[PDB]
Structure formats: C-alpha cells, structure tokens
Design a binder for these strands. Structure first.
Length: 114
RNA sequence: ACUGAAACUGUAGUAGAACCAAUCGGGGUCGUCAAUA
C-alpha cells in the first residue's frame, strides 16, 4: 500500500525496540474536541516524565540505568515545549467506544505508557 | 551734655518594671523504571 503521514520517532528506549511508528494519515481519520482536561493531564504527565529523571539526565546518563542498550525517550529529554500540547503535536490517544462515540481518556507519548 | 555695674537656666530625678527563644517531628525505610514486539 501507499500511505502518507508523519513519523512518530521516539528513541531506542528499550532493548528489544527495532522500529519507529509512522501515522498513516492517508486513510481513515476521526476528529475529537481537545478538552482542557486532557491539556492539564498531558502537562502533568509530561512533567512527571521530565522531572523524575532530571538528576539522571543532568549528570549526563544517556539512558535509564535499569534498561540496557537504551536511551532516554523523546518526551523525557525534550524541552518544556513538549509539556505544552501545541498545534500539530503528535500523541497516542487512549480511547474507547461508548454511547456510540469515541471517548478519549488520555494522551500518551508512548505505546506502553507511564 | 556721655554705654550702668554685677548675676552659671540651674537644682532633685537609675529608661525602667513585667516577659522561658520556645512549640511539633522514631535518623527513617522497597519496587519501581523504561516501551514496545
């Protein structure tokens, strides 16, 4: 198939990780209102990612001590610009179907998330 | 069409009486962290 879209390149965050993912915008798409609730949740979650390892990042560790062959995930080393959910920022959305509608629970920077 | 003279603003009087630098706090202890394939 031929597709187009964007690449959600994070980094080699895990030792078994081989691939980045790219968002096949060429096809089906669904738009959902961005509430202020999801905005604060993102900022709080991304603050958590960036603050938790601040000591490890500042002392110059290239990746988390507990996972070998791996480097900081994009959201951790990214700036506070990442912490603000600005126009065209890429995400994973945690979603379910209810009342016949796609409810969105959270926005997450990675597949298996904090 | 003759300058008055002479005279300590001084004497007595404790910036002091009362007031707590003090109240609370085991030098203690477990699972997280990373995200894909």
């Amino acid at each position: 198939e031929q597709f187009e879209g964007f690449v959600y390149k994070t980094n080699k965050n895990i030792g078994n990780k081989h691939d980045e993912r790219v968002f096949i915008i060429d096809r089906e798409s669904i738009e959902i209102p961005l509430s202020r609730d999801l905005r604060r949740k993102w900022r709080e979650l991304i603050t958590s990612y960036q603050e938790i390892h601040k000591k490890e990042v500042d002392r110059g560790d290239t990746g988390p001590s507990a996972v070998n062959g791996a480097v900081w995930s994009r959201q951790i080393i990214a700036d506070e610009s990442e912490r603000n959910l600005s126009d065209g920022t890429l995400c994973y959305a945690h979603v379910k179907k209810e009342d016949g509608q796609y409810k969105i629970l959270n926005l997450y920077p990675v597949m298996i998330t904090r």
